Amino acid sequence: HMEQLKCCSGILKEMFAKKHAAYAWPFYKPVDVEALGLHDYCDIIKHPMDMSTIKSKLEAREYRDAQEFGADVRLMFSNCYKYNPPDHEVVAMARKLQDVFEMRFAK
Numbered sequence: 247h248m249e250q251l252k253c254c255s256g257i258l259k260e261m262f263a264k265k266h267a268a269y270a271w272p273f274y275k276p277v278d279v280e281a282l283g284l285h286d287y288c289d290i291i292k293h294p295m296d297m298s299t300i301k302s303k304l305e306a307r308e309y310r311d312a313q314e315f316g317a318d319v320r321l322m323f324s325n326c327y328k329y330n331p332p333d334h335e336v337v338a339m340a341r342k343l344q345d346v347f348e349m350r351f352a353k
């Protein structure tokens with residue numbers, strides 16, 4: 247349970263790595279709804295999630311185990327698949343970052 251969270255820090259560190267930056271950047275920080283003019287985001291997405299928030303919750307020991315950490319990572323991608331049209335570029339970027347996550351998470 248607790249032994250798994252040090253692997254979670256390594257996964258998140260890998261997701262913030264420069265080799266993933268071309269597709270990972272939209273997930274580093276919360277969606278800036280004001281800068282993008284997305285007035286309905288908070289009405290559709292009840293639980294916003296991004297990599298910086300997950301890092302804060304992980305350092306605050308808010309995840310009991312890897313499953314709790316993985317649920318927030320998957321909430322981040324699901325928020326993206328739910329809010330956006332399926333053909334939007336951010337959805338293709340979310341799929342590439344999710345492959346990086348799923349690979350390290352399974353291993």
Ligand SMILES: CCNC(=O)c1cc2c(-c3cc(S(C)(=O)=O)ccc3Oc3ccc(F)cc3F)cn(C)c(=O)c2[nH]1
Binds near residue numbers: 275276329
């Ligand atoms: C159809 C309505 N949807 C959106 O406009 C929308 C935007 C985002 C962003 C996002 C956030 C920022 S920021 C750092 O300024 O907060 C800047 C750019 C962003 O996305 C892109 C915008 C245009 C592109 F062509 C390619 C993008 F990647 C992140 N995520 C997780 C989303 O789900 C999302 N949806």
